[PDB]
Design an enzyme around this catalytic site. Structure first.
Site, short mmCIF file in Angstrom:
data_model
loop_
_atom_site.label_atom_id
_atom_site.label_comp_id
_atom_site.label_asym_id
_atom_site.label_seq_id
_atom_site.Cartn_x
_atom_site.Cartn_y
_atom_site.Cartn_z
N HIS A 7 -25.11 -32.54 4.68
CA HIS A 7 -24.78 -32.82 6.07
C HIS A 7 -23.35 -33.37 6.22
N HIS A 14 -12.82 -22.75 -1.48
CA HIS A 14 -13.79 -21.97 -2.27
C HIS A 14 -14.68 -22.96 -3.03
C1 COA Z 1 -10.35 -26.34 -15.70
C2 COA Z 1 -9.85 -24.91 -15.78
C3 COA Z 1 -9.31 -24.46 -14.42
C4 COA Z 1 -8.84 -24.99 -16.86
O1 COA Z 1 -8.28 -23.71 -16.98
P1 COA Z 1 -6.99 -23.59 -17.98
O2 COA Z 1 -6.00 -24.70 -17.67
O3 COA Z 1 -6.73 -22.08 -18.07
O4 COA Z 1 -7.56 -24.29 -19.35
P2 COA Z 1 -7.94 -23.68 -20.79
O5 COA Z 1 -9.07 -22.63 -20.75
O6 COA Z 1 -6.67 -23.17 -21.47
O7 COA Z 1 -8.44 -24.96 -21.48
C5 COA Z 1 -7.48 -26.12 -21.57
C6 COA Z 1 -8.26 -27.33 -22.06
O8 COA Z 1 -9.16 -27.77 -20.99
C7 COA Z 1 -10.50 -27.97 -21.47
N1 COA Z 1 -11.34 -27.52 -20.36
C8 COA Z 1 -11.25 -26.33 -19.78
N2 COA Z 1 -12.05 -26.23 -18.75
C9 COA Z 1 -12.70 -27.41 -18.67
C10 COA Z 1 -13.69 -27.88 -17.77
N3 COA Z 1 -14.16 -27.15 -16.74
N4 COA Z 1 -14.17 -29.09 -17.96
C11 COA Z 1 -13.66 -29.87 -18.99
N5 COA Z 1 -12.74 -29.45 -19.86
C12 COA Z 1 -12.29 -28.25 -19.67
C13 COA Z 1 -10.48 -27.16 -22.67
O9 COA Z 1 -11.60 -27.45 -23.52
C14 COA Z 1 -9.11 -27.28 -23.32
O10 COA Z 1 -9.22 -28.49 -24.02
P3 COA Z 1 -8.21 -28.71 -25.36
O11 COA Z 1 -6.81 -28.93 -24.71
O12 COA Z 1 -8.99 -29.79 -26.09
O13 COA Z 1 -8.55 -27.39 -25.94
C15 COA Z 1 -10.99 -23.84 -16.15
O14 COA Z 1 -11.43 -23.89 -17.55
C16 COA Z 1 -12.19 -23.85 -15.25
O15 COA Z 1 -13.08 -24.69 -15.29
N6 COA Z 1 -12.34 -22.80 -14.45
C17 COA Z 1 -13.52 -22.69 -13.52
C18 COA Z 1 -13.51 -21.28 -13.07
C19 COA Z 1 -14.68 -20.91 -12.20
O16 COA Z 1 -15.70 -21.44 -12.19
N7 COA Z 1 -14.60 -19.74 -11.61
C20 COA Z 1 -15.85 -19.19 -10.86
C21 COA Z 1 -15.29 -18.34 -9.80
S1 COA Z 1 -16.35 -17.71 -8.63
C1 JB2 Z 2 -30.52 -39.17 1.88
C2 JB2 Z 2 -29.15 -39.72 2.30
O1 JB2 Z 2 -29.17 -41.10 2.38
C3 JB2 Z 2 -28.17 -41.74 3.23
O2 JB2 Z 2 -28.56 -41.37 4.49
P1 JB2 Z 2 -29.15 -42.27 5.59
O3 JB2 Z 2 -29.27 -41.38 6.76
O4 JB2 Z 2 -30.31 -43.07 5.29
O5 JB2 Z 2 -27.96 -43.30 5.81
P2 JB2 Z 2 -27.08 -43.62 7.15
O6 JB2 Z 2 -26.39 -42.37 7.62
O7 JB2 Z 2 -26.25 -44.84 6.83
O8 JB2 Z 2 -28.17 -43.99 8.32
C4 JB2 Z 2 -29.14 -45.04 8.11
C5 JB2 Z 2 -29.74 -45.24 9.47
O9 JB2 Z 2 -30.89 -46.07 9.25
C6 JB2 Z 2 -30.94 -47.08 10.27
N1 JB2 Z 2 -31.75 -48.15 9.75
C7 JB2 Z 2 -31.45 -49.02 8.71
N2 JB2 Z 2 -32.35 -49.98 8.54
C8 JB2 Z 2 -33.37 -49.65 9.45
C9 JB2 Z 2 -34.60 -50.19 9.68
O10 JB2 Z 2 -35.05 -51.24 9.23
N3 JB2 Z 2 -35.36 -49.57 10.71
C10 JB2 Z 2 -34.86 -48.46 11.39
N4 JB2 Z 2 -35.69 -47.98 12.36
N5 JB2 Z 2 -33.68 -47.93 11.15
C11 JB2 Z 2 -32.94 -48.55 10.20
C12 JB2 Z 2 -29.47 -47.39 10.46
O11 JB2 Z 2 -29.29 -48.18 11.64
C13 JB2 Z 2 -28.83 -46.05 10.42
O12 JB2 Z 2 -28.75 -45.34 11.64
C14 JB2 Z 2 -26.72 -41.37 2.97
O13 JB2 Z 2 -26.41 -41.93 1.64
C15 JB2 Z 2 -26.62 -39.79 2.93
O14 JB2 Z 2 -25.27 -39.47 2.35
C16 JB2 Z 2 -27.76 -39.17 2.04
N6 JB2 Z 2 -27.83 -37.74 2.53
C1 JB2 Z 3 -14.66 -15.07 -6.18
C2 JB2 Z 3 -14.26 -14.47 -7.53
O1 JB2 Z 3 -12.89 -14.34 -7.62
C3 JB2 Z 3 -12.36 -13.35 -8.56
O2 JB2 Z 3 -12.72 -12.17 -7.97
P1 JB2 Z 3 -11.79 -11.12 -7.34
O3 JB2 Z 3 -12.69 -10.01 -6.99
O4 JB2 Z 3 -10.87 -11.54 -6.30
O5 JB2 Z 3 -10.89 -10.71 -8.58
P2 JB2 Z 3 -10.68 -9.26 -9.30
O6 JB2 Z 3 -12.00 -8.76 -9.80
O7 JB2 Z 3 -9.54 -9.44 -10.27
O8 JB2 Z 3 -10.23 -8.24 -8.11
C4 JB2 Z 3 -9.08 -8.53 -7.27
C5 JB2 Z 3 -8.86 -7.25 -6.52
O9 JB2 Z 3 -7.91 -7.59 -5.50
C6 JB2 Z 3 -6.92 -6.55 -5.41
N1 JB2 Z 3 -5.77 -7.13 -4.78
C7 JB2 Z 3 -4.91 -8.10 -5.29
N2 JB2 Z 3 -3.86 -8.35 -4.51
C8 JB2 Z 3 -4.11 -7.59 -3.36
C9 JB2 Z 3 -3.46 -7.50 -2.16
O10 JB2 Z 3 -2.37 -7.97 -1.88
N3 JB2 Z 3 -4.02 -6.60 -1.22
C10 JB2 Z 3 -5.19 -5.89 -1.52
N4 JB2 Z 3 -5.61 -5.05 -0.53
N5 JB2 Z 3 -5.83 -6.00 -2.67
C11 JB2 Z 3 -5.27 -6.83 -3.58
C12 JB2 Z 3 -6.76 -6.16 -6.87
O11 JB2 Z 3 -6.02 -4.94 -6.96
C13 JB2 Z 3 -8.16 -6.17 -7.38
O12 JB2 Z 3 -8.90 -4.97 -7.23
C14 JB2 Z 3 -12.87 -13.44 -9.99
O13 JB2 Z 3 -12.31 -14.70 -10.53
C15 JB2 Z 3 -14.45 -13.51 -9.95
O14 JB2 Z 3 -14.88 -13.93 -11.32
C16 JB2 Z 3 -14.93 -14.56 -8.88
N6 JB2 Z 3 -16.36 -14.13 -8.62
#
Ligand code: COA
Ligand code: JB2
Ligand code: JB2
Ligand code: COA
Ligand code: COA
Ligand code: JB2
Ligand code: CL
Ligand code: CL
Ligand code: CL
Lengths: 207, 207, 207
Positions: C136, C145
């Site tokens: 919420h 993203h």
């Molecule tokens: C964090 C991130 C952006 C780093 O990318 P990068 O800079 O190209 O990093 P590298 O792959 O070269 O790794 C560099 C270092 O980071 C560490 N590392 C990489 N990703 C990490 C992560 N997510 N969490 C913790 N450590 C991470 C590596 O282990 C390496 O450590 P080292 O220096 O001890 O080897 C990438 O690994 C990542 O998490 N990408 C997420 C992508 C994603 O989910 N895409 C889904 C798309 S829909």
């Molecule tokens: C599950 C979730 O827990 C928490 O949500 P939450 O709605 O309980 O917390 P808050 O947004 O601070 O709202 C608590 C509400 O609870 C009310 N409240 C607090 N004490 C009382 C009570 O004794 N009696 C009644 N009738 N109401 C009470 C407050 O006045 C306030 O409006 C937050 O940490 C959220 O981030 C989380 N999604």
């Molecule tokens: C949300 C996701 O992001 C990424 O997906 P993605 O589909 O964008 O990435 P790719 O598979 O490399 O495809 C990118 C496509 O985007 C095209 N593209 C790249 N630049 C342009 C552009 O300027 N105009 C148009 N019309 N197309 C462009 C490339 O030529 C290619 O076909 C990947 O990292 C996936 O792993 C992830 N699911």
């Protein structure tokens, strides 16, 4: 404070209440009114604080949900609501998948995108928050809270009022004590006692 | 051991079997019987151990699912089942989202809340467990197991019999070898060879 | 390049495009054509590069989606598309749960298995990828993203063009600046400024 006949009373008017209201409406329920300690939320009127509960019951409202995130407070307010003659409903989003062998308590929130598998038991006033997963044979104590995107593998037990933060995970067979907090992203790989805080991958108790 | 006509035989009678049974029933399938090495599970009779398979086939049952979590064992029992003349069905929960360009093998479990995206290939006897996500262009080897709430980004390859624990994650383009284990919560950021254990954020091989 | 009357034009023909195409088809939409910088994708013809946009508009196509993962590029191409007279549609998979109080922009991708809760605001050209959870009162800037299986707790703000990798998590109330990257699995527990990279549990800025 004039109300329609027959809807659900909500204790709490915060962010959690908003989600709960929408779950109830998605099921075709009507939300009658909110009672909030600060005496509308998504169109539901706030009619007073908890001192308004007797008046609500007197006018025929008898169904209630406690939409309070704090576990100990929620538990206390659920008891108060029942004393005042309300039945605690469940707020189960239509999109949640709850296995037919799951045992549910009362006052339970089960949010959108949840899955709960076979032979799990869910205590009164638990929260199973958005996208959470509960695998088979789990046991969730009263008033615990599984935060959004959290996941329990099979055979996990969660004590009363425990709280698992966003994205926490628990491996099979682990038991987590009452009143324990697992931080966001914590990965629990061994049993946790009562009343501790555990964080990290793997989760470690922080004194 | 008298059985109805035409349902599914289950190999295995544990916790995984419970979930599988419920997936099949949610699709309107009937579960005929279980064979278990300890010779009911959610109302399905255990009729014997694997020596009962010929008898089951003889009486006209021909559809089977292997509900065994251990990947190497599941693979072996799938082969045995096919030798005995059974067809391996898939157990795909109604709530799972399987893209129309996904290629599925046989004997595959796809649990509640799963999403599998475009042009992914899923080998025989794979398990895609509860809430798991498989992004586009993934390749899942025979008898691998993606644990609950695990997630593969795009273009990930998972070798035969690999196992990803609860909440494991793999970044795009990574290849994980056969027989490898990623611990719960592990975040795999580079290719993993065969037959290793990797844990942590980021995941690191543990000797 | 002869096309049917009235479908959606796609900018981009990669892996993201495949998923988007399937979301649109799952809703009963028709995909007319792709424009790709390398001048078919799941049966949709590639008709040219972006220089083909005027021709497409001239023949009566007026609906478009930008299926480009790179946030800054997607944002630029969305502007170009609008200049050329196209309306940006949303690509919301049927399985996604989008609360009725959510505000959506245009050109937004919401993939399978997503849940978005009450009073969240989703900017133009955002991607909410497969299985992601948005709690919420969240605020998602234009062209950000949220990667697959990522999760935002309540009250989180994500700046323009920010990117959260697979399985990233953010605790309640946190603000993440524009152009920031959270690595896969990162658990964000404090506000992040603009233009940084943060990794780990908890997430830490990497210089
Ligand atoms: C964090 C991130 C952006 C780093 O990318 P990068 O800079 O190209 O990093 P590298 O792959 O070269 O790794 C560099 C270092 O980071 C560490 N590392 C990489 N990703 C990490 C992560 N997510 N969490 C913790 N450590 C991470 C590596 O282990 C390496 O450590 P080292 O220096 O001890 O080897 C990438 O690994 C990542 O998490 N990408 C997420 C992508 C994603 O989910 N895409 C889904 C798309 S829909
Ligand atoms: C599950 C979730 O827990 C928490 O949500 P939450 O709605 O309980 O917390 P808050 O947004 O601070 O709202 C608590 C509400 O609870 C009310 N409240 C607090 N004490 C009382 C009570 O004794 N009696 C009644 N009738 N109401 C009470 C407050 O006045 C306030 O409006 C937050 O940490 C959220 O981030 C989380 N999604
Ligand atoms: C949300 C996701 O992001 C990424 O997906 P993605 O589909 O964008 O990435 P790719 O598979 O490399 O495809 C990118 C496509 O985007 C095209 N593209 C790249 N630049 C342009 C552009 O300027 N105009 C148009 N019309 N197309 C462009 C490339 O030529 C290619 O076909 C990947 O990292 C996936 O792993 C992830 N699911
Ligand atoms: C663990 C947690 C309870 C700690 O809260 P807190 O004690 O107020 O801690 P702080 O924010 O002051 O941070 C204290 C320290 O813990 C670290 N930390 C905080 N949360 C962490 C987490 N989840 N994992 C690992 N480390 C964490 C901090 O980086 C800081 O480290 P330092 O001493 O090096 O700076 C909290 O950060 C958390 O994870 N909350 C989850 C909330 C949630 O998901 N709510 C969703 C509701 S529906
Ligand atoms: C990684 C794993 C396979 C290790 O199992 P194991 O070798 O029996 O290990 P142990 O439980 O004896 O723990 C050994 C050590 O690993 C650490 N550890 C265990 N699991 C870990 C994990 N997932 N991530 C990081 N560290 C982990 C322990 O804290 C311990 O550290 P120490 O040497 O400081 O104490 C296991 O803990 C795991 O993650 N299993 C996932 C199971 C799963 O999800 N099943 C769902 C099925 S559907
Ligand atoms: C996917 C999951 O895997 C595991 O589940 P599981 O159901 O396979 O594990 P268990 O509950 O121990 O049950 C295994 C069952 O598998 C039976 N079994 C074990 N070996 C055999 C066999 O050779 N043939 C047959 N027919 N059955 C066999 C056991 O006797 C037992 O009943 C657990 O780790 C769960 O936590 C996890 N959900
Ligand atoms: Cl209402
Ligand atoms: Cl049956
Ligand atoms: Cl089409």
């Amino acid at each position: 404070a004039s109300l329609a006949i027959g809807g659900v009373v909500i204790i709490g008017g915060g962010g959690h209440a908003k989600v709960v209201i929408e779950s109830l409406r998605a099921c075709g329920e009507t939300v009658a009114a909110i009672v909030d300690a600060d005496p509308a939320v998504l169109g539901v009127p706030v009619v007073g604080d908890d001192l308004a509960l007797p008046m609500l019951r007197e006018q025929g409202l008898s169904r209630l949900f406690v939409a309070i995130g704090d576990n100990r407070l929620r538990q206390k307010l659920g008891r108060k609501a029942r004393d005042h003659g309300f039945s605690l409903v469940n707020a189960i989003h239509p999109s949640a998948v709850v296995s037919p062998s799951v045992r549910l308590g009362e006052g339970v929130a089960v949010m959108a995108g949840v899955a709960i598998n076979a032979d799990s038991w869910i205590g009164d006033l638990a929260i199973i928050n958005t996208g959470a997963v509960v695998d088979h044979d789990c046991r969730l104590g009263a008033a615990c809270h599984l935060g959004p995107a959290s996941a329990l593998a099979g055979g996990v037990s969660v004590g009363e009022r425990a709280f698992l933060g966003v994205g926490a995970r628990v491996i099979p067979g682990v038991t987590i004590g009452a009143d324990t907090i697992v931080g966001a992203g914590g990965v629990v790989v061994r049993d946790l006692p009562d009343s501790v805080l555990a964080i990290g991958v793997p989760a470690k108790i922080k004194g």
